[PDB]
Design a protein around this ligand. Structure first.
Ligand SMILES: OC[C@H]1O[C@@H](O[C@H]2[C@H](O)[C@@H](O)[C@@H](O)O[C@@H]2CO)[C@H](O)[C@@H](O)[C@@H]1O
Ligand code: BGC
Length: 311
């Protein structure tokens, strides 16, 4: 048996995503390779956990039993244990499984087979390891289809592991837009709800090369009293949903891209953290050392003003 999800949310506390790493097609393709020293660096700065985006789908066969490939599995073990060695808690997920988003019907059983294998693999790992069902469900994996798939995933996971806390995200890309449509089974009592926060999207994502039409936002600033008032109102809505449904909240990803002016990024980041903490939510900054990075792996220095904002 596990622990009260609010206790495990407290255990998560402040975290950071190590992104553009294991969620790319191959680790290193998007610019980051998880170095073991990264865990000393993150723990020493004061973080309580790390979130590790993992694209298991490109490292598992496409035909039954959809076995995850040996070498990749060993690599993930090395990352998880590297973080556990420093006393960091760890969130692992299934990230960028695009076929599942485009054709959930056809990939439902493969997705559940991946969780069967991941849960089997780590069922005896420490209680500070968290299982995040699926990053940003979207597209044809509609709010309605997600509520059904997540319940199926929970059944699969819980059939093997009654100890680890599970993290459940929202549909429509995992933000607040489909939160009110999310439904977590009453029988599950060991889960945390996660939401990604990048609002205002045009500000956080301005110039993002992977977002169509983002060039039209370059230069946009953030920081007026109305900007602050609007963020607060959105957080208030999340808080109330949490209160109503009785589920802890984890803001699993939030951050502003390097193209936005530094001062607005710092202002936006420092402000989001202050407002999440007031609400006692756990969270993970997006991300450690890449395009939204706070740590420069070459110089081995942190962007001190941005770190200060995260603390
Ligand atoms: O899709 C590729 C891009 O991903 C970007 O990170 C995403 C992350 O995968 C999402 O889950 C969510 O958190 O938003 C992030 C930022 O849009 C990544 O930063 C880019 O470099 C990738 O090209
Ligand atoms: O709202 C749509 C956007 O959601 C973001 O979380 C993704 O990173 C973008 O790729 C996507 O275009």
């Amino acid at each position: 048996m596990g622990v009260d999800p609010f206790e495990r949310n407290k255990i998560l506390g402040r975290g950071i995503n190590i992104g553009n790493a294991l969620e790319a097609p191959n680790e290193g393709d998007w610019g980051v390779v998880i170095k073991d020293e990264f865990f000393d660096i993150i723990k020493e700065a004061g973080f309580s956990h790390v979130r590790i985006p993992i694209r298991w789908s490109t490292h598992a066969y496409a035909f039954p039993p959809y076995k995850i490939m040996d070498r990749f599995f060993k690599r993930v073990d090395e990352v998880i244990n590297g973080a556990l060695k420093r006393g960091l808690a760890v969130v692992i997920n299934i990230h960028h499984y695009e076929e599942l988003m485009n054709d959930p019907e056809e990939h439902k059983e493969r997705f559940l087979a991946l969780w069967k294998q991941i849960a089997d693999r780590y069922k005896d790992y420490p209680e500070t390891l968290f299982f995040e069902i699926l990053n940003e469900p979207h597209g044809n994996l509609t709010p309605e289809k997600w509520n059904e798939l997540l319940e199926e995933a929970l059944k699969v996971i819980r059939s093997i592991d009654k100890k680890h806390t599970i993290i459940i995200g929202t549909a429509e890309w995992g933000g607040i837009s489909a939160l009110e449509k999310l439904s977590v089974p009453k029988w599950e009592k060991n889960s945390i709800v996660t939401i990604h926060y990048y609002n205002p999207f045009e500000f956080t994502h301005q110039g993002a090369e992977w977002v169509e039409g983002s060039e039209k936002w370059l230069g946009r600033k953030w920081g007026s009293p109305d900007d602050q008032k609007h963020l607060i109102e959105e957080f208030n809505f999340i808080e109330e949903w949490s209160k109503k449904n009785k589920r802890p909240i984890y803001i699993g990803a939030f951050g502003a891209y390097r193209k936005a002016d530094l001062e607005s990024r710092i202002k936006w980041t420092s402000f989001v953290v202050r407002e999440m903490e007031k609400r006692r939510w756990s969270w993970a900054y997006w991300e450690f050392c890449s395009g939204f990075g706070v740590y420069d792996t070459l110089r081995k220095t942190w962007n001190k003003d941005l770190l200060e904002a995260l603390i």
